[PDB]
Design a protein around this ligand. Sequence first.
Ligand SMILES: CCCCCCCCCCCCC/C=C\[C@H](O)[C@H](N)CO
Ligand SMILES: CCCCCCCCCCCCC/C=C\[C@H](O)[C@H](N)CO
Lengths: 48, 49, 242, 242, 58, 58, 245, 297, 49, 99
Amino acid sequence: ATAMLGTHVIWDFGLQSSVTLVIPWISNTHYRAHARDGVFDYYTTGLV
Amino acid sequence: GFPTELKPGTNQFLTTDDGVSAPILPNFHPTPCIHIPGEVRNLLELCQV
Amino acid sequence: GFPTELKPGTNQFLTTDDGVSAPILPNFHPTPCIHIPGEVRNLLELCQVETILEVNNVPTNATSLMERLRFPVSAQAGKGELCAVFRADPGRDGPWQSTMLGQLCGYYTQWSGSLEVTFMFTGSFMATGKMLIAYTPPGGPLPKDRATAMLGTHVIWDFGLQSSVTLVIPWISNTHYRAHARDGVFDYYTTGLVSIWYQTNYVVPIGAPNTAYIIALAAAQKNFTMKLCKDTSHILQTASIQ
Amino acid sequence: GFPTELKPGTNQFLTTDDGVSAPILPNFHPTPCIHIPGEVRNLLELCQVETILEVNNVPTNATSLMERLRFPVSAQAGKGELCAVFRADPGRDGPWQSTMLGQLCGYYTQWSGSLEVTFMFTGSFMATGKMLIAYTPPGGPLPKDRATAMLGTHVIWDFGLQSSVTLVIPWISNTHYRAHARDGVFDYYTTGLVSIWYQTNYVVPIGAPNTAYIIALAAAQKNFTMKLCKDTSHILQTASIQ
Amino acid sequence: SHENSNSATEGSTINYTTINYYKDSYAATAGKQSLKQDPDKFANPVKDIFTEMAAPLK
Amino acid sequence: SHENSNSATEGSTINYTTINYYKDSYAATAGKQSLKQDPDKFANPVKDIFTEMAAPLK
Amino acid sequence: SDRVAQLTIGNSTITTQEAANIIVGYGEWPSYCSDDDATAVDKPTRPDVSVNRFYTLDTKLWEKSSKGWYWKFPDVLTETGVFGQNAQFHYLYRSGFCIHVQCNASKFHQGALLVAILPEYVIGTVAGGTGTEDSHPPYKQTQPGADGFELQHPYVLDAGIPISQLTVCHHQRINLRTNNCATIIVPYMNTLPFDSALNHCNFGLLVVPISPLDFDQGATPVIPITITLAPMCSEFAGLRQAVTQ
Amino acid sequence: GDRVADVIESSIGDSVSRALTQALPAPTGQNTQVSSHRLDTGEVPALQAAEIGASSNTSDESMIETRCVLNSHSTAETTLDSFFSRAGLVGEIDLPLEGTTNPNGYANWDIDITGYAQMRRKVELFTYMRFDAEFTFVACTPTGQVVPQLLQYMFVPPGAPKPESRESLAWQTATNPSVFVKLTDPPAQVSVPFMSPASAYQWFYDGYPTFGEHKQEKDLEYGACPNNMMGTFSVRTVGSSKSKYPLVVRIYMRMKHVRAWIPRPMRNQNYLFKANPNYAGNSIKPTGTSRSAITTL
Amino acid sequence: LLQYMFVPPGAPKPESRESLAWQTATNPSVFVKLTDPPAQVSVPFMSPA
Amino acid sequence: EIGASSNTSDESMIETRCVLNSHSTAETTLDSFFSRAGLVGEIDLPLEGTTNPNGYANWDIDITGYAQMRRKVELFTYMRFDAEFTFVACTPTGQVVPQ
Ligand SMILES: CCCCCCCCCCCCC/C=C\[C@H](O)[C@H](N)CO
Ligand SMILES: CCCCCCCCCCCCC/C=C\[C@H](O)[C@H](N)CO
């Protein structure tokens, strides 16, 4: 119930065995560098 | 308050008065009539037989 | 002094008179009306909606009142057995009392038109079968076998993608309008019977359940009409409300 | 002998019938009318006039009934204290009974529209201050602090040349019309609360008095309307006049 | 149409919509009045009117 | 003709045939209503309608 | 081109491979309030994507002896998201809904659910059984939140009205041979253009198994049902402190 | 001043109610067309999907071989005008001489038309109703005997003062509407407007009218719509003294200009209380009658 | 004072004087005093044929 | 201090929406407010007693003997109206008699 508040898709298995989740561009910056532990956590894209 | 005066012949039931009475059923449409043969329109049809 | 004469029908209160009465409040303008959705303009909008015709009116206790909305379909010996039977009379005491058609028709005395009965299969996708839903017009006694019932109107329904068939009970009456049947002289107004027979069988593979249920859903059609409003009879009330 | 039939509603006296009655005096021509000034044509002319809303309805004895028209404003410790609070319900028993709006609305059952409340500062010219007059819509309990009250509608009023501010209590209702609130189920028709908080303080120099008073003046607006005339309830009478 | 104009509004700017079966106009119905207001007469009775935006005391 | 339009259907698409001897329209007769139906609103309330012949689930 | 659906509103998306169709309630789409119909003069906030989006409440397990459940609207979303804060912070409310109910099972399971929308689903009591007591239902049972409440007497829907005639309201049927979703789009239904979300509930959502679930052991015995619902065309008005009830 | 494309291309502020339907004139029943045999594939008008929630669009022209029938049956008796414009009992007030209910020459009766099951169930078929009305007061003795007595029928709306006795000063009916009648005369009959603050009455209110915590103490508020409380109807024997004729006033209400929204399932269980859809859970009755076997009638 | 109720077929017949069918919600009824003239209602053709 | 009332609006004091008001001002007219028959007098013709035991009674017209209609006319200073009087005669018990 905490996760549905983000972006999400609900995928029912069937004929088409594949869904796609588009992780959309949501950033304060125009460009985004490579995240890592510490100060460069400013550039995290989120979780899935 | 349209002033009127009630005349003799009031609160009497005459069996041969062709007047308007109040309906019990609004917006009732009866069963439609078909061609039945032998429609009597006058009793002087039956006095000639 | 306009002379008048008062006729019979004076100082009587007839409950069904469309007359002018005196207002209590002058120059009152009511609250304006907004668009509320679902405006009913005629009750023959609600007679065309399909609601549940409870054929299995066998149980009487409290827990099994949900058993009364679906009748079962098991596997048989293939001899064209009988599944279920029910009368096609909406105003009569039976399966149709559980329907809006069967409750609005209590408020009317005469009805005319065709009916719909929709049966939906509530079984497994691997389940398959065929049934014969016959409408036996009046005069017809209860058929003892399937070969006697096919002579009436019928449909054969194969289970599949579309889980639902509709049997139209067509208007077959000597009269233009038809009143409410019951025991005795008013059997002149019976509409007939509806019977359901195993055409082939209820076939099922290994693993899937050997029994299913069918849900009946009854309605009316665009040619249906009711007449001569009365007060309903198949619901009563114990007095002393509160 | 024009035949007629007498219907129900005969030989009844309804006090609100706009009918023709018989004159006593024929060919009477009344005294002609002159131009008298102040012709009232509608009572919604008198609901737009500002009259005194007595918030300080604390005293009960005879001498202090003039204390009931003005509520005080002293100097505080600057912690955003509460000065006064009152409901925004005109027909309800409270400050508005002292207003023409609150007395004409007793003669009606349903009201709709925006209200005005005008507060005038009755202090010294060298006195200065700022107050927050908040309108808390329904649902809102009594705010315990000023930061909870600013979330509603509010004005901030700085004393100066113009000694008067007006708070418009706007029409916020689920219903088009609104009846008279009271304790219990008719709390569905509450309009909300009005609360007055010290924004800064009441600042005063040497010599000028350390306390003042504010006079509230309540009215209505051009969109106000009343409906369904009744007989008033917040004034009664001991019988045996003379 | 032939009836005495002898009601208590004959000589008023407002026009009524009345019913009468007599020659005396004061016997007629109350009717419908005209919906005309003058709140400026009681609420802003000033010689020098001022606008909403204008702070009145200059 | 001069009477308040103050019945509970003033502002409705349906037109009535009423009798009234007062200025209040809510005192008038029930009249005749218009014979207009909308069974599609309760019986086929679907975004994508389908025909009689068309098996609905393709 | 009917058994597949993609319901996209906001930052959410529901795909379906075994749909029936979409029901639009009483033939009206959700909408905003006109200037003719409105009375409140305040300018309403219309947040278009932060509250008009799909929320997911909780799961109920369809067992053999399940009787039914109901969820009252908009009580489901008053403690959930940016919708349920504006509803607290505001006095009025106006939105439609798109309800979506999921129940997936094999081709060897069988059963049916009735998924109905009943406006003004007032709850009744058993009156102590005898019928002498004018008892009233508690707040736990009238407005039970997003965890719903189960029916004790589902034949009469715990109000004295029969389940059979409930198909005169909106409804779809989840037949596990035919479908596993049910989409109902509801407009705003009230006598008033606006009302408070915390005191008044506009409608109820009934989920009732008309046919009992059946499977042979070896299969999966746990068959959940999940309610997934989006506000549509939402509007709020009358801003004050936040109140929960 | 709209500049971005996320607000020019918007549907926010679309107040027009987009409907899928259209009301068409149906003065008569639908006529029947002539139909023949069909022996084709692809088209199957008898196979439906009730899972969609819609109803069968089938015909008898598609399912049997039919003849041309010109239906001249009218749909004019199923209108709400005809179904509801039938005066029914909504109340009954007794003004006895002695006893326990009203032994003091006056009686107040709060308006609810949900005290007799015959008119209640007929309006509780719908959720919202907007109508004018016509009340009719049939006053008489318990024995039905008519007597020479004068009565006063006062309507006391909400907010207005209820009368505490027969000689109370609220009977002066200066702004409240009242009616005086003799019982030797016909029944009174007044017409009434739509008097609610809302656009319609509603017999089912799913919610509470007051804010605040909802405990077992004030739980009786559940379901109370004050938009339906049109007030109180009072009645006295006009006099300064005690009467000698016991009286019973019966109230008969008839709707006019009816509009209604959102049909409901009709009640199959017995009512027990007013403005309360409670039932006896021990004695639950089916909405029909039973058989013994499904194969035998 | 009398009550003249018309009870069509299917509708419930009243078993006593205090029965609940006299409420005449959909059935047509007439109330009269006997000091008043005779009642008089007009009726349609009400048969299914 | 000018003695006039506030010419303010809600369009000037909050952010408002277009509301088309269709509420009528027709019930606040004097025609509607006063055309409601109220008690202005009450005369007793007893058989014995002290007030009028001799089969006649004079009652000087003042409509200021019952508080409900008085306070409603005393809202104004001057009034010009036609009237309609109505006489409801009965016994103390309410009994109607042939007299
Ligand atoms: C001179 C006497 C006149 C009496 C007029 C009475 C006014 C009544 C207006 C009709 C009100 C409709 C029925 C009321 C609502 C519902 O029955 C209940 N209050 C809610 O369950
Ligand atoms: C056949 C009987 C007809 C009786 C007609 C009575 C005429 C009365 C005309 C109305 C007078 C207006 C009220 C009088 C004035 C004030 O109430 C007081 N006199 C002054 O306080």
